[PDB]
Structure formats: C-alpha cells, structure tokens
Amino acid sequence: LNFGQVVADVLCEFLEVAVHLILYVREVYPVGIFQKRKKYNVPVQMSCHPELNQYIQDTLHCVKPLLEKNDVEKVVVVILDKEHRPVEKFVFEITQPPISSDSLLSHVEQLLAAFILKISVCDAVLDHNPPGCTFTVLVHTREAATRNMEKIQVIKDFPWILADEQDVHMHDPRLIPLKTMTSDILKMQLYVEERAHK
Amino acid sequence: APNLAGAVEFNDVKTLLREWITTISDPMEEDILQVVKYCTDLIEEKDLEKLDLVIKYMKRLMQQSVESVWNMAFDFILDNVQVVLQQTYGSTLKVT
C-alpha cells in the first residue's frame, strides 16, 4: 500500500504542530518561546525561536517522502534526560487499514484535533520529567531498506544516520495510550512510553 | 566501540568485508546499511584513519567486482559517509 503526497503533507503538518506541543507540555523548552495559535480548530503552542522551528521543519521535510510511500512505521519524539538516557517517548504508529470507515481528508480537523487535545492534557497522566531534558526524533521504517536513506537524505545541511541501541532503549517502560483513530486509508495511534522511575 | 557485525579490530572488519563482497553478488540492504552505520560511528568515535582505510578497501573490492550491484553499493555507502563528514568536520573525504 502507499499513502499519497497530500496525505503525507497532511501528516507532516500534523506532526509539526504535535512535536511543538509535546515540547511545551513536557517543558523541554521554557514557555517564554511559545505563542498560542490555532490548528485543527483548537488552540496550540508553537515555538517562536527560529533555530528550533528550522530543526523541526527540517526533520519533517525529510520524513515526508517516506510517508508518501508509506514507508514509516513509527515517528517517535524521544525526550532524553540530562545524561542522555531516554525518559519519555511519544510514538505515532502508522498503519494501513484493509470499506465503511471515516473519510480522512473530509474530516481532517475533527480527526487530528483529538490527538492534539490529548497531548494538551497528557501531563495529567505522565510523571513530571527531570530538568534539562532535550529531545530527538526517530523514524522507524517498515523495511531496513536503502531507499529509505536515499529519500530522507534530502538536505545537505541536515544529514540522517542510523540510530543505535543507546538512542532507543528505555528501562522498564510504562504505556499510556492517548488516541487511536481509523479512516479511509490511514490508521494512526498515539501513545506514550514513560520510564518507570524518572 | 565501533564494530562491524561484532568485528571491532580493524582487520576483523577488513576480512569480514572481503568475505562479504566476495561470496555475495546480490547483498541484502540490511547489510549495506550496517556498513554505513559502521562508518558514521567511525566518524563519531573519531577514527578517521580506520574509516579512510575501510572506505578505500571496499572501494577497490567493490568497483573491481563484475556485479554492477556492488558498484552502486559503494556509491551509496560513500554518499552517506560524506554528508556526515561534511557536517562533523566540515570536509569531505578526498577520494582520488
């Protein structure tokens, strides 16, 4: 199966907002840089810091062509602690459904806002993170394939590498589902894995 | 701390690559990628000597092989090596 280009733009637009939001709600960066805005007919936070926005934009500019071909299993916003050990993970798990369901494009803002609303309140259910947490994005691909790297490597200034064990492993994780939704062509699930003592 | 398939010592890498490019004539990308991972770790671990040797060994063996496959394998391997060099050392490996 294969997602479209416009689906893939939608998804990336969506993830951009979300990554921004997660960063705020978990206090990875201080609130001084965030400015209220409205996407998917709901309020959100978005950094104003230009370096920050470029990083994220760059990250997703690159993921897009892999979403186009539906070559991504998980986009993951990993929050690392002060000693570079993972404390928290926000996983977007993407799937193809095999008809009676909702039309994704017709109902975009309904469907994605749900995700957005849950992230907003998700601090209610997680534990508070340590200070000086930084973050990273990790892309799980469906296949270990060369083409994935050909396609993600679109910005000379912004290379990608294969991550390792260090970047991914979390000790004693706990699972906090936030949202699941199914549609015409795309099923996506958001959930948090947090570290058992953080 | 950079290993190829467990192979850490240089020559253990070098044999292991030789056997790999010598036995196989349609290599699984899984394997190709780990070589790319191996090399970017060499950049991150600050071992440019080894990496410059490794690059070259398999430049020779890969472009020597009759399989065009291996010849494109190398080009891929080096391209990813160079965008990472270019951002870590601000330079690109000189490959004469």
Partner: peptide, 20 residues
C-alpha cells in the same frame, strides 16, 4: 537497529535558547 533513522544534528539545547 537497521531500520531506525535519526538526524545527525541535535536540536538547540535550553541554553542556546535563553538568548534569542
């Protein structure tokens, strides 16, 4: 592992933020 990718560049830390 073989099918997980991530950017080489680490994002701007908290410090490099404070001042812009």
């Amino acid at each position: 592992t073989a099918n997980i990718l991530k950017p080489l560049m680490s994002p701007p830390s908290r410090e490099e933020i404070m001042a812009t």
